[PDB]
């Protein structure tokens, strides 16, 4: 990976600006439930990661630029997960590129396990806060020399999950008849890639966590560090088992199935949030 | 560090071992510190020093693999382990377990020495692990971080019944019928990366997290074993009782644990 | 960049020993509140880190030798924080150099967020214990081959924060009229460099932590490993927010610097000579 410093981020951004004239104001990272969001983007240019020098590589992932709900967007189709062995610089560079391209708001989804006992499979949990277990343990994405062109050395994570975007998301769900599926909660990052043990889930629930997943927080930290507002949502793809005696367990195909089942609704929700954002 | 624990490299190591012994092990046993006696009962033994195995990790006496039978069943015993607090890599720790898989191991029995958090524990008690909290794993130091080796298992392994409940039940029964059931507990093991012992504040936090014992090993091996379908039984010997507040200031047990493991193996189901 | 082994640590200590004849008994690592401690030292011999070969670089840091309240000291001005990406050996080496130079007591300050709800901005929290979140998660400074020259493989952290040094520190504060600022508590390390979220702060408070910061514990572990007594104090530079819907740190340090400096000087004055 190339260092996600201003020099390298500029080179990548400048290369992208030759390929498209679209100045995105919203960046979207597609997780669970957002698998067909790129189809909804109109007047789009699709740039495979392979066509961007010094951009991380993960068919190839794509950067999609276009209009969604009357706004200019860049959609990241293809993520770089820490459990896959990717570096901090790999995860940070795409977010910092979004910043240089013009992104003001980052919207992201992911799949998570439901710790909170009131959660149902397929529920949406808007992140209102997080617990960054890797970050507390010296694997924070920002470890290393601070890049002052982007942000400060010790970023505050106050209002990390923009309260006004959260309020809007809830309002849109309620107005469109699926407010009953929507919660707000604390997301804890398990580095992964193992699912959480019953003892681990019990610990995490008692720490005050509502959902547990293996991603997202590193991007959120980079976004907040460089001043991008964040809206993040976990799709509850499994209900955490807290009891060792239980034979119930997380199953990959069912986790993927839940994402796919909820995709139309999740994308609709994101689209309807975007159309309500103030603009001009 | 060391060679990637992929199918090609693990196969190469396994094939080398299969030229040094004709014993196909069904059960793998990992001896913890002060617990080398678990190998002493091995009948018709064949000893392979780690130095004889190219690409197998090396200790820094030499470590050995011991093949033979215990209570009639074919076993491989690991004498010398690779601890994460020593600076060994994920691949180093993973490779021996994946080698055991290819050699034919279906059940892994692991022992370690641990600190007692649960206040009902006494020095010298055995705590069968029923579950774990992998603090390094939750914090982005999980042994499986990196490309998944699909030949061994799936990207996101579930850890349900990680400590096989039928093996736990059998182990408790064997202890009770041999008159040391009073020494045996079941509990949750939490891994401290180490190598520092836990401070009183750490011990209190860990106890309140729902942990019964704390140690510096084992979980990484358990994760790799479960990832590739090996059933796991694991037991901690309580060698220290954790102090919970700042204001406040073995040999026979190894032999007993040896006997216990032997008597468990005698009763293991056999297809 | 160099292993903190006996061979490398000795080379560094020997280089320092030809630049100064002062044999330090007390080492002091300046965090928040101790920025001006170097100015108060008498018979100063300032050695910049650039002038010590094999010594880690941060810039330009200084090792100041001299006397403080009649006792020989070495003051580290310029620390090596793990959130900056320094290696374990980088952080360990200066402490082990201190050991070889003659240091018996290490006094350290830092800036920390107040979790305990009774704390006020500018309070002093003497560390009596810690929770080393990085260490529990496989990022302990001692991971790797144990350097037997300095200590044992599995160091115990019983009495890590020497109880007699804590007693002395509280007594000095009480008799100089600022005992009302002094608390004793548990420090938890957040690797950093992000400040802790409300959910993180709530979790940490419920684990039994009184203050949270991003330093100190690694140095304390190396010091205890090699048998140096430790006194550590956090300056409360921020009050943790525990619920969502929610410069000041640098101002608190600069404001309380004089008092903390005075406190450290007066502690060194009352230390046992035998
Ligand atoms: C439940 C989702 N699993 C299978 C763990 C995939 C993790 C990818 S993530 O964290 O971006 O949703
Ligand atoms: C005295 C050794 N301690 C710290 C208990 C570590 C135990 C090593 S183990 O896990 O193989 O038993
Ligand atoms: C408040 C200052 N923080 C963020 C903890 C940075 C470290 C300062 S230090 O060295 O005094 O701990």
User: Which chains lie within 8 Å of chain A at 3 or more CB pairs, if any?
Assistant: B, C
d(CA A159, nearest CA chain C) in Å: 6
Asked if A199 lies within 8 A of B148 by C-beta distance, the reply is no
Which residues share a beta bridge with B108? B28, B232
Contacts C194 to A, Cβ<8 Å: 132, 135, 140, 142, 154-157, 221
Among B146, B129, B125, B149, smallest CA distance to B217 is for B129
Among A89, A232, A241, A54, smallest CA distance to A157 is for A232
Provide φ and ψ at A18, rounded to 5°.
-75, -30
Among all bound ligands, the one having the nearest atom to the CA of C58 is 3
Among all bound ligands, the one having the nearest atom to the CA of C213 is 3
Contact A111, A253 (CB under 8 A): no
- Cα–Cα distance, A28 to C108 (Å, whole number): 45
Technique behind this structure? Answer: X-ray
Active site residues of A: 32, 59, 81, 83-84, 111, 214-215, 238, 252
- Cα–Cα distance, A189 to B73 (Å, whole number): 43
Q: Return the sign of the alpha-carbon dihedral for residues C33, C36, C40, C45.
A: positive
The token duo for A247 is: 């034979």
Beta carbon of B158 within 6 Å of any ligand 1 atom = no
Q: Give CA separation, A166 vs A107, A184, A194, in Å.
A: 11, 8, 30
Which residues share a beta bridge with C188? C131, C212
- Cα–Cα distance, C79 to C57 (Å, whole number): 9
Which chain C residue shows the shortest CA-CA distance from A203?
C203
- Cα–Cα distance, C142 to C152 (Å, whole number): 10
Bind-site residues of C for inosine: 111, 195, 214, 237-238
Measure the CA dihedral C93/C98/C101/C103, to 10°. Answer: -160
Contact B255, B237 (CB under 8 A): no
CA-based radius of gyration for chain B: 18
In total, the C-beta contacts within 8 angstroms joining chain A to chain B are 108
Write down the residue that tokens 């056999």 correspond to.
Answer: B270
From the CA of B160, how far away is ligand 3's center (Å)?
Answer: 41
Domain that holds residue C74: 1-274
Contact C146, C152 (CB under 8 A): yes
Choose among A129, A131, A154: nearest Cβ to C193: A154
CATH number where A265 lies: 3.40.50.1580
Domains of chain C: total: 1
- Cα–Cα distance, C135 to C217 (Å, whole number): 9
Among C204, C154, C267, C167, smallest CA distance to B246 is for C167
Q: Which residue puts its alpha carbon closest to atom 4 of ligand 2? A: C154
| Selected residue of C88, C244, C253 to mutate for chain A interface (largest A Cβ count, 10 A) | C244
Which chain A residue shows the shortest CA-CA distance from B130?
A244
| Selected residue of C87, C134, C136, C166 to mutate for chain B interface (largest B Cβ count, 10 A) | C136
3 state DSSP class of A35:
coil
Beta carbon of A258 within 6 Å of any ligand 1 atom = no
d(CA A245, nearest CA chain B) in Å: 8
Q: Is A109 annotated among the ligand-binding residues?
A: no
Q: Is B240 annotated among the ligand-binding residues?
A: yes
Given in angstroms, what resolution was this structure solved at? 1.8
From the CA of B218, how far away is ligand 2's center (Å)?
Answer: 10
Among C264, C229, C220, smallest CA distance to C82 is for C220
Asked if B158 lies within 8 A of A83 by C-beta distance, the reply is no
Contact B262, B70 (CB under 8 A): yes
The number of helices, as runs of H, and strands, as runs of E, in chain C is 7, 9
Contact B237, B257 (CB under 8 A): yes
Burial of C86-118, coded b for 16+ CB within 10 Å and e otherwise, reads bbbbbbbbbbbbbbbbbbebbbbbbbbbbbbee
From the CA of C37, how far away is ligand 2's center (Å)?
Answer: 42
Beta carbon of C237 within 6 Å of any ligand 3 atom = yes
The token duo for B21 is: 């012994």
- Cα–Cα distance, C73 to B123 (Å, whole number): 44
Element at A175 (helix H, strand E): helix A163-175
Contacts B85 to C, Cβ<8 Å: 140, 142-143
Which chain B residue shows the shortest CA-CA distance from A208?
B209
Beta carbon of B156 within 6 Å of any ligand 1 atom = yes
Contact C189, C216 (CB under 8 A): yes
Contacts B220 to C, Cβ<8 Å: none
Among A212, A216, A217, A215, smallest CA distance to A201 is for A212
- Cα–Cα distance, C22 to C20 (Å, whole number): 6
- Cα–Cα distance, C106 to C221 (Å, whole number): 12
Write down the residue that tokens 């080698």 correspond to.
Answer: B99
- Cα–Cα distance, B192 to A137 (Å, whole number): 12
Contact C56, C49 (CB under 8 A): yes
Among all bound ligands, the one having the nearest atom to the CA of B216 is 2
Q: DSSP code of C38?
A: G
Contact B234, B159 (CB under 8 A): no
Asked if A130 lies within 8 A of C244 by C-beta distance, the reply is no
3 state DSSP class of B29:
strand
Q: DSSP code of C160?
A: S
Question: How many CB atoms neighbour CB A136 within 10 A?
Answer: 28
Q: Give CA separation, C134 vs A140, B3, C53, in Å.
A: 11, 27, 29
Which residues share a beta bridge with A26? A73, A105
The number of helices, as runs of H, and strands, as runs of E, in chain B is 7, 9
- Cα–Cα distance, C66 to C136 (Å, whole number): 38
SS (H, E, C) A103-170: CCEEEEEEEEEECCCCCCCCCEEEEEEEECHHHHHHHCCCCCCCCCCCCCCCCCCCCCCCHHHHHHHH
SS (H, E, C) A212-272: EECCCHHHHHHHHHCCCEEEEEEEEEEECCCCCCCCCCCCHHHHHHHHHHHHHHHHHHHHH
How far is residue B54 CA from its own chain's centroid? 23
Beta carbon of B215 within 6 Å of any ligand 2 atom = yes
Gaps in chain C with C–N over 2.5 Å, residue before each: 59, 246
Which chain A residue shows the shortest CA-CA distance from B149?
A84
- Cα–Cα distance, A112 to A124 (Å, whole number): 10
Angle at B144 between CA B96 and CA B67, to 5 degrees: 15
- Cα–Cα distance, B131 to A245 (Å, whole number): 10
Q: Return the sign of the alpha-carbon dihedral for residues B245, B251, B256, B261.
A: positive
Choose among A128, A145, A159: nearest Cβ to C84: A145
């Amino acid at each position: 990976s190339v260092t996600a410093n201003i020099e390298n981020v500029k080179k990548v951004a400048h290369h992208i600006q030759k390929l498209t004239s679209i100045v995105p104001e919203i960046g979207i990272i597609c997780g669970s439930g957002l698998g067909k969001l790129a189809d909804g983007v109109k007047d789009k240019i699709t740039i495979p990661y392979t066509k961007i020098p010094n951009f991380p590589q993960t068919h190839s992932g794509n950067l999609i630029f276009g209009t969604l709900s009357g706004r200019k967007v860049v959609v990241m189709q293809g993520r770089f997960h820490m459990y896959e062995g990717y570096s901090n610089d790999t995860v940070a560079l795409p977010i910092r590129v979004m910043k240089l391209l013009g992104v003001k708001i980052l919207m992201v989804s992911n799949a998570a396990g439901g710790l909170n006992r009131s959660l149902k499979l397929g529920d949406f949990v808007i992140l209102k806060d997080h617990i960054y277990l890797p970050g507390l343990g010296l694997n924070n994405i920002l470890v290393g020399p601070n890049q002052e062109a982007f942000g400060t050395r010790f970023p505050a994570l106050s209002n990390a999950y923009d309260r006004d975007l959260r309020k809007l998301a809830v309002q849109v769900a309620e107005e469109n008849g699926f407010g009953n599926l929507v919660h707000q909660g604390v997301y804890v990052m398990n580095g992964g890639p193992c699912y959480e043990t019953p003892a681990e889930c019990t610990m995490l629930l008692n720490m005050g966590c509502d959902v547990v997943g293996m991603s997202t927080i590193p991007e959120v930290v980079i976004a907040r560090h460089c001043g991008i507002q964040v809206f993040a949502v976990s799709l509850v793809t499994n209900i955490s088992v807290l009891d060792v005696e239980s034979d119930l367990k997380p199953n990959h195909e069912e986790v993927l199935a839940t994402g796919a089942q909820r995709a139309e609704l999740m994308q609709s929700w994101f689209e309807k949030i975007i159309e309500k954002l103030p603009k001009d």
